[PDB]
Amino acid sequence: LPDSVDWREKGCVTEVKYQGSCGASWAFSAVGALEAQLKLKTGKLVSLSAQNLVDCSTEKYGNKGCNGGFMTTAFQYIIDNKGIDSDASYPYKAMDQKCQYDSKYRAATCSKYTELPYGREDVLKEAVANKGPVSVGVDARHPSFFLYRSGVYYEPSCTQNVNHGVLVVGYGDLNGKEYWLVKNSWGHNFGEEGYIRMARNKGNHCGIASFPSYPEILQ
């Protein structure tokens, strides 16, 4: 129930990444969510390897590397694999490569993941407050999304059908405009230092609360 949350202020969010020509936003959404749970448990902030997911969380998990994927099955791959490599050791190349997972460089683990009910922006607010950053999809197929520079994003022709993976690391209000605080993966030059504030409590705007999920690392 805090009116604003920003998980960057708790040291739980790594640097904004740059996906480039590879459609791996699902992998960035996944590692970003797990990175925060990693920080909470261990005190260490370490970027996790999106490339590991692109190359290894593939056909068994319904994913297609640079041609798309699910965050939930990415999570499941980490559970099945008993690990995910650090980004430093397995860095992002923005292309489809052979799986090169090496347990020697394991930087995190995943115990479970939770999916939130469709459209429930109230449940999403609670989870971001009481659990941490939440992986979500948004409908990003709008020039205005690409052109966004600052403020609370509102797109009248936006739909609830998601197509782009992002990370909800907070929420709040700017002079009564409620927004979601969203980490994108288009580098630092997009939006507000790589972030976009998207309208909140506007009937699941851009589908932000259509398919939320978040992972956990248990004791």
Ligand SMILES: O=C(CC1CCN(CC2CCCCC2)CC1)N1CCc2c(c(-c3ccc(C(F)(F)F)c(SCCN4CCC(F)CC4)c3)nn2CCCO)C1
């Ligand atoms: O995660 C889940 C759970 C499902 C339920 C179980 N099945 C079974 C599956 C089949 C066998 C192998 C593994 C298990 C997969 C995960 N969702 C449930 C429904 C759902 C989700 C999304 C969703 C969520 C986030 C994003 C983001 F953020 F990336 F943009 C996108 S963009 C499209 C991603 N998509 C991934 C596969 C292919 F690359 C084509 C591209 C879509 N859309 N939809 C509706 C259409 C699909 O029903 C999230």
